[PDB]
Design a protein around this ligand. Sequence first.
Ligand SMILES: CCCCCC(=O)OC[C@H](COP(=O)(O)OC[C@H](N)C(=O)O)OC(=O)CCCCC
Lengths: 56, 232
Amino acid sequence: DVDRIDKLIAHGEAEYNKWRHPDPYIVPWAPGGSKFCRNPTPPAGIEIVYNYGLED
Amino acid sequence: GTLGRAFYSVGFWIRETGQALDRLGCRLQGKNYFREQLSRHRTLMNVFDKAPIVDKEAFVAPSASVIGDVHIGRGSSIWYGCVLRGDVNTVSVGSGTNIQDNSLVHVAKSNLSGKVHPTIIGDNVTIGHSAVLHGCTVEDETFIGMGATLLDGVVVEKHGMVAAGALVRQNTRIPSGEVWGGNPARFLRKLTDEEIAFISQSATNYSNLAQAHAAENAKPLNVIEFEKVLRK
Ligand SMILES: CCCCCC(=O)OC[C@H](COP(=O)(O)OC[C@H](N)C(=O)O)OC(=O)CCCCC
């Protein structure tokens, strides 16, 4: 029944959110870890001009 | 350098003061022949310190306007209406070549567009009519078509005949003995041997014809027309 699932999912979510382990596991290179953006790969396309500020 | 330009300006000042004194003296006598609209053109116009150098054996048409640092080689012809201008850099014209009617050579006046490239013309280069070489180097023994639009940075090497109405893009060399034409310059075929001989043949005939003109175009002024113009 569709009437006996919404209450169940609400109860499950409420019970699950009650304990969270405030320090969950995140992989260090994962988005939130201890070495996220440690030494990221340089951007794909960028160039550096040399002779700028010259005259004539 | 800078000091020379100061003396040049002082020369203008003193020359104009003397010219004004001359005009006052002439006008005080009751003569106003200084008010004529005579064409103040020089076929060898210069700037402060360029003074175009031309070889004595070369021929330059009266309608030609050689301006700047233009150097002219031995036996080359400078025909009517050409606007060879060489102010910024040298414009070397080879020995035995020819610059036909209503042509010109730039030096790419404005220095904004990168560096200005001097124009170099090789020997026996049969530059065509209405050539608009925009400051490009051209090697010896080659032909340039009528209505060509060579731009700066182009290296037309030896025997690189260029078809009429060409618009060869800047910094695009023409291979030796290969013709480039159309809009833009695209490969058409390879240069043939009879045309290879014909290029030098045409150069020699044009040089001889220029010698004939220079023999006949240096005739005295024929004061009959001078009297005709005044008497009206
Ligand atoms: C020593 C030089 C004197 C030369 C005198 C002279 O040439 O007068 C002409 C000039 C201007 O007069 P115009 O416009 O008719 O020049 C007509 C044309 N440019 C011409 O040359 O005729 O006079 C002055 O400004 C000077 C005023 C102060 C004068 C002291």
